[PDB]
Design a protein around this ligand. Sequence first.
Ligand SMILES: [Cl-]
Ligand SMILES: [Cl-]
Ligand SMILES: [Mg+2]
Ligand SMILES: [Mg+2]
Ligand SMILES: [Mg+2]
Ligand SMILES: [Mg+2]
Lengths: 223, 229
Amino acid sequence: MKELIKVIAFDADDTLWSNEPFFQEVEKQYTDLLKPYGTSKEISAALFQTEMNNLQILGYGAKAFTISMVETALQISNGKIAADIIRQIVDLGKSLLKMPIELLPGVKETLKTLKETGKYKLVVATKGDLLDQENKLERSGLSPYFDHIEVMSDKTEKEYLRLLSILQIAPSELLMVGNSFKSDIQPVLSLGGYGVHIPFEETFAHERLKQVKRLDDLLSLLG
Amino acid sequence: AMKELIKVIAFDADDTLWSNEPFFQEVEKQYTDLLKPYGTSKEISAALFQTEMNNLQILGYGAKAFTISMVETALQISNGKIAADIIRQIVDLGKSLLKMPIELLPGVKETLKTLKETGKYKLVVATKGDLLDQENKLERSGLSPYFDHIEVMSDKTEKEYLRLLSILQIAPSELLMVGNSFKSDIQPVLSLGGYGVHIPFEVMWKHETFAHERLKQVKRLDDLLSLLG
Ligand SMILES: [Cl-]
Ligand SMILES: [Cl-]
Ligand SMILES: [Mg+2]
Ligand SMILES: [Mg+2]
Ligand SMILES: [Mg+2]
Ligand SMILES: [Mg+2]
């Protein structure tokens, strides 16, 4: 921590700001549009199937989500769905790209304090559409605290190794902070790095892992 | 002269390493053919371009953005009249861009293989567009072994080239950028203090730049090899 960690990487969505609630409300509104074709659970299962079938070419993010929404609508309706439902679906997807940014507790004070130490390089480590993530950061007001954003095509060990290489450090010099144990924490621990898990409201404990309730609790862990 | 300064050689990908525009053009032609009832190809293309530009600050560049704009333009220009079957065809067109065959341009494989074999540089791709799509393209191209890093950019202005330099941890003076687009690939790097090799893309047979101290213009990518030897 003292003279091991050089880089503190932060997940963005549900770590720096709320994201999943906005997405889930969009998914709810989508499933309301496809009522004739199934229960909300059923429509969500079909959409997830499409997302998974599209994963290798579309990847992650709001643009991918929008395209899978349109496809699933076309599919489940046997290509008979009204064009106006398609217009609504595209509008829903675009709402995701203009979502207002609501910072989570302690985020602003933590990043300011870390910036003012001048001790760590601070980066955002996120999947998704590059422009979207860039825009979210800008409108969060947090851009002055961050050296830059690393947008990733996935969050497996392979992509974290690419991140480490780009940053010119070894795994033991990286601290990753995020809400997802599976995507933000596990892969980084597996490589040799450190994690702070901040759940957003199945895991295991680990010597290079701490779980905290809110992001500002990070500051005592560094001291 | 330049050959001792350079630490990183960045390449544009589309229409530099492989042919891209022809396939995008053929998808757009098929699009206009689908929307023939609502306007001339010239008219359909103009409405599409206007949508792309109005969506640029939230959708940006690349095949996903294009798909979404093709859909939105079809809906708007048909005043909602268009059938779902046609929207499905449009989505499949956009997705066809993500499975495009990669056809390497002249001298590309030999230039990159030779440069990698010197051990002398970091070789990177510097490209706009969707990150996954550009990684998939590089993988399908067979060229991935020669590149240290793909840098996907949200635009190709001085601001984004400074980001790249900062990420690479080098000075403008230590970057050589190679690309087919003088406006996007070459001028911004020259303006920051970097070097450029302009390699015009000719495959379009379109009906028919300046000289600069740190610019070379070449016809074929492997021409690069003797600028650096
Ligand atoms: Cl993420
Ligand atoms: Cl580009
Ligand atoms: Mg997250
Ligand atoms: Mg991959
Ligand atoms: Mg190009
Ligand atoms: Mg795109």
